[PDB]
Each structure stands twice: as C-alpha cells, then as structure tokens.
C-alpha cells in the first residue's frame, strides 16, 4: 500500500524562526479527477489531530496564514514562516488518493537549546521490596539534551540486557531538557548472587560514559 515517509523525524526549532518539513509518497498522489489529495495535520500534546492543509496548498478554514503547503507528485513540503508556541507537537502528512488512507509517521517539533549532559543517579532496591522477594535497580539519567541517549547495565562488571526496562519523558516545558529512566528488575535470590551493580550512561556530550554504581556490601 501507499507509504507516507516524513523527514525529519524530529525537528529542532526556535520560537519566531521559520521551519520546514518534508513528506514523501511511494506513489504519485494525483487522482484521476485531477486533484492531489494530500493533507497535513497538527496534533498538539493532549488533544486530537487538527487539519492544517487539505489539497497540497490549500489552508484550512481555521488556520493562520503562516502555514504553507507546496509540492506535487511524490514530494511535498509544509513550511512555517514563524514557529509560534501553539505550533509545537507532531505533524502528520496524509494521503486520500489511494485506498486505503495512510498517514505519515509524524514529525515531532521540539525547542532547540545548548547541549546538556545527564545527571546520572543509581538506586539500590529498598528493603521493603526485598521483604517481598523483589529487587529493582533504578537508574535516572536526568535533565539532558538532545533526546538520543544510551544506557548500559553491568553486574560485577559484566554486561546485562535481560530484565532492563526504559522510559524517556517528553521535552520539559521550562528548561527544554529530556530525562530517561532505566530499570533492571530482578528477584531477591538473583540479586543476592552478585555484589556490584553499575549504570553506564553514554551521550553525545562526551565520548566517556558517565558511570554510576554501588556494592551490596555497603
């Protein structure tokens, strides 16, 4: 079926300055009637999708003129003359020419800022949890930028992938940093079999990983 591919995946923008998104269809979107059925949408965080542009260049009845639809065939571009506060979120391109309808994967819009390293904090399991025979080793990688970051778990210096669960937050509305949790989950019997537990954070601020660990016997 017809595929909608959007570039970039994440666009870093600054309020007031312009911005430009791309969308790419695996087939020509020109229908037999002569019209090209390509829409654009904006999904603000917390609410539904919202139509911006309906036939490649036509602006929706309720949208300000700072949005501009261009293109034809397979290549289309949404362009913003000045990014304002209310434009932040995901942008989806959509084709209605071919059955079935298909949306693009979305382009997230996020505020730009100077890079910032993560403040890595590792946590041993609580004794309360250990009474129930569980052992979760939590690791916060707090307040960093940009989004992309790498965690590595080690146990007695040996790498661990099984039983790790992760979770990135959205961008902060105040300092524009991201944060991410990493959670090795173990049973008490498993946990007591080893001493060292290490959380290792690799980010584009440094080639050196930020290491944080602890030993059960202290």
């Amino acid at each position: 079926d017809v595929v909608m591919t959007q570039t970039p995946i994440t666009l870093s923008v600054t309020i007031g300055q312009p911005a430009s998104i791309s969308c790419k269809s695996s087939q020509s979107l020109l229908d037999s009637d002569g019209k090209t059925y390509l829409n654009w949408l904006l999904q603000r965080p917390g609410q539904s999708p919202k139509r911006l542009i309906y036939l490649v260049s036509k602006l929706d009845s309720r949208v300000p003129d700072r949005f501009t639809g261009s293109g034809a065939g397979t290549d289309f571009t949404l362009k913003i003359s000045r990014v304002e506060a209310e434009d932040l979120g995901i942008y989806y391109c959509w084709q209605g020419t071919h059955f079935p309808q298909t949306f693009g994967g979305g382009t997230k819009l996020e505020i730009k800022r100077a890079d910032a390293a993560p403040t890595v904090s590792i946590f041993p399991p609580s004794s309360e949890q250990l009474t129930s025979g569980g052992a979760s080793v939590v690791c916060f990688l707090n307040n960093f930028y940009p989004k992309d970051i790498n965690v590595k778990w080690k146990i007695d210096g040996s790498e661990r992938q099984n039983g790790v669960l992760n979770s990135e937050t959205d961008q902060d509305s105040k300092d524009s940093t991201y944060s991410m949790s990493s959670t090795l989950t173990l049973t008490k019997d498993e946990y007591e079999r080893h001493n060292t537990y290490t959380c290792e954070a690799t980010h584009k601020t440094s080639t050196s990983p930020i290491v944080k660990s602890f030993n059960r016997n202290e």
């Binding site: 539904s48 949306f103 609580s126 949890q129 979760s136 669960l165 202290e218």
Partner: protein
C-alpha cells in the same frame, strides 16, 4: 458546527469485542460525507480503520481482516465501531471523524486481562557519595493497573525539580518512577515524602524517603 464525540468502554478483554459509539451533532450523517474511524497507537502512528458513507455503504482497511463492522443509527445521528477478537495490538486512542477535517476528542481504549491492582510504592534513596548541594531522590511505583497514577512530593509543595517518567508495561502491569532533586541542606535535614495516588482503586500512599 460539526462536532463528534466518542463513547464506550475504555477497557476490553482480549477474547471479546471492542465496541464504541460516535455521537455526531450539528450535522446530519444521512445528508453528508464519509464517516470514519481512526486509531492512534502508543508509537504516535495513525491507522485508518474504516468508514460508512452517508448512503450506508462501507469500506474497511484490509489490515483488519473481516473483524470490523461500522454500523449506523440515522434516528439518533450515530455511527458505531465494532472490532472483534481483540488483542494487545488493538490498544490505542480511537477517533471518529468526518471527511472535511473534523475529529472527535478521542478515547483511549486498552486491551488487557488485568484486574484493578493498586501499586506498591518503594523509596529511592542513594547509598554513599553524594556530590554537592543537590541530591536526587525518587519513588518506584510498581505493579499497578489500570492507568493512571498521580505522584506528588510533600503534598505538591515540591515542584522545582520533579520528573515523572511515563508508565511502562511489565507482565500485564504498569510501572513508573518519579524523580525529585533538592539541595542536601534540605535532606535528610527535613522531610521528603512522595505521595502516590491510583484513582481506579482509591489508593493513597505516602512514602518517606529515609537515607541509607
């Protein structure tokens, strides 16, 4: 005014059928356009499911086999989604919509065998070697269902440096932790309590963060 409203159970059992209802107002479904159902998955990705034309005619996305029917009720100006043989895959936010850029608010349906389950709340405190003024504490909220929960610190009085990570699934139950960062002149020099709330089970647990 073209206005659409979704309505129906937000939780269905994996074997059963997911049935919803779109109550459209300020426009007649019989005189009009195509009337669609769309869903959005966790990944943010949107899938078109199907529609019913004002004539009563239908089309469905082949991705949903023949396990979807979109019926109608012209007497109350409504169209209905019915999705059968549901799974984890079918967990999404479901939207009803009309062809000219009209979307409903959308309801989040989850698909799960899980019973209502209150969270266990565990303290997150360091072990040895805090650097400077600031130190980060937390609260692990493990093994709860369904969503959501609400985490606060000192009954909300701590806002400054507070994250709550999005929930994640872990053997049919949700887990998240909330981080807080404060100067060490304030901890353990005075109380840092986390307050977790899980409305679905009327839970309200505080957990004081003790060192060591």
């Amino acid at each position: 005014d073209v206005q659409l409203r979704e309505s129906g159970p937000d939780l269905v059992t994996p074997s059963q059928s997911l049935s919803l209802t779109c109550t459209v107002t300020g426009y007649s479904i019989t005189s009009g356009y195509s009337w669609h159902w769309n869903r959005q998955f966790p990944g943010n990705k949107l899938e078109w499911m199907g529609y019913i034309h004002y004539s009563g005619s239908t089309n469905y996305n082949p991705s949903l086999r023949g396990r979807i029917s979109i019926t109608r009720d012209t007497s109350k100006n409504q169209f209905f989604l019915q999705l059968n043989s549901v799974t984890t895959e079918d967990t999404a936010t479901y939207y009803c919509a009309r062809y000219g850029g009209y979307w409903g608010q959308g309801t989040s349906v989850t698909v799960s065998s899980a019973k209502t389950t209150p969270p266990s709340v565990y303290p997150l405190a360091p072990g040895g070697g805090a650097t400077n003024s600031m130190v980060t504490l937390g609260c692990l909220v493990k093994g709860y269902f369904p969503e959501p929960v609400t985490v606060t610190w000192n009954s909300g009085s701590l806002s400054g440096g507070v994250h709550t990570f999005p929930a994640v699934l872990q053997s049919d139950l949700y887990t998240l932790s909330s981080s807080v960062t404060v100067p060490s002149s304030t901890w353990p020099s005075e109380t840092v309590t986390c307050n977790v709330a899980h409305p679905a089970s009327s839970t309200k647990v505080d957990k004081k963060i003790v060192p060591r």
